[PDB]
Design a protein around this ligand. Structure first.
Ligand SMILES: [Mg+2]
Ligand SMILES: [Mg+2]
Length: 224
């Protein structure tokens, strides 16, 4: 933990793709709402058609986030290839982030490796025609500007890798005002596929990239 780094338990969600700036700013409940996690879980239960997108509420004021990736393989994998690819993916992505943190962020390389590999949540999209998931490194924190600075590094990783999952990292998600679709909710009123939670993580806070509650196991770094 660190005095200079405070947490966040207020989750800001957009209720559709492409919300105006004016509607985010005025927080029109038709388009956006801030929730505690228990409120968010209840809202999802009570709104079975919802399409929810987590976003930083005021990233000029506060932009601490968990490292996350949106993996977009528009192809099907054999089950065993997928399991092997996930494990190799974790190694490749953690090595890549740890090197960037070490050289660009004054970070402790082994703490990035350990925090990333030891605890992460995985979703699985129900679309069986592809291999889509979101990953949250629950205990590895940074700033959104650091993720933006790391965008080309991840792009180059996705180009050099032989791993089909690493190759499918969607680096366009690292940008200002970005969104991550909330697990269990739909993308749009016309597509009914969802991401489901995966063991061993079954609480919604484990699937949110703006939920920040560090403990001494947590590790934080940012651009130096
Ligand atoms: Mg995706
Ligand atoms: Mg994507």
């Amino acid at each position: 933990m660190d005095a200079a780094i405070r947490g966040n338990d207020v989750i800001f969600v957009l209720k559709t793709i492409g919300v105006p700036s004016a509607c985010r700013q005025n927080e029109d409940p038709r388009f956006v709402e801030a929730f505690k996690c228990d409120e968010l879980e209840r809202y999802i239960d009570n709104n079975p058609e919802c399409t929810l997108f987590e976003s930083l509420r005021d990233e000029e004021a506060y932009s601490i986030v968990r490292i996350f990736m949106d993996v977009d393989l528009d192809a099907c994998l054999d089950e065993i290839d997928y399991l092997t690819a996930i494990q190799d993916f974790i190694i490749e992505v953690s090595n890549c982030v740890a090197r960037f943190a070490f050289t660009e962020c004054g970070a402790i390389h082994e703490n990035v490796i350990k925090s990333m590999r030891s605890n992460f949540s995985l979703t699985k999209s129900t679309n069986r025609d592809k291999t889509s998931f979101h990953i949250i490194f629950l205990d590895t924190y940074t700033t959104m500007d650091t993720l933006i600075a790391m965008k080309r590094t991840l792009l180059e990783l996705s180009r050099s890798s032989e791993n089909p999952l690493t190759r499918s990292i969607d680096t366009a998600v690292y940008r200002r005002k970005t969104t991550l679709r909330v697990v269990g909710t739909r993308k749009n009123p016309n597509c009914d596929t969802i991401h489901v939670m995966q063991p061993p993580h079954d609480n919604i806070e484990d699937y949110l990239f703006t939920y920040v509650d560090m403990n001494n196991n947590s590790y934080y770094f940012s651009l130096q």
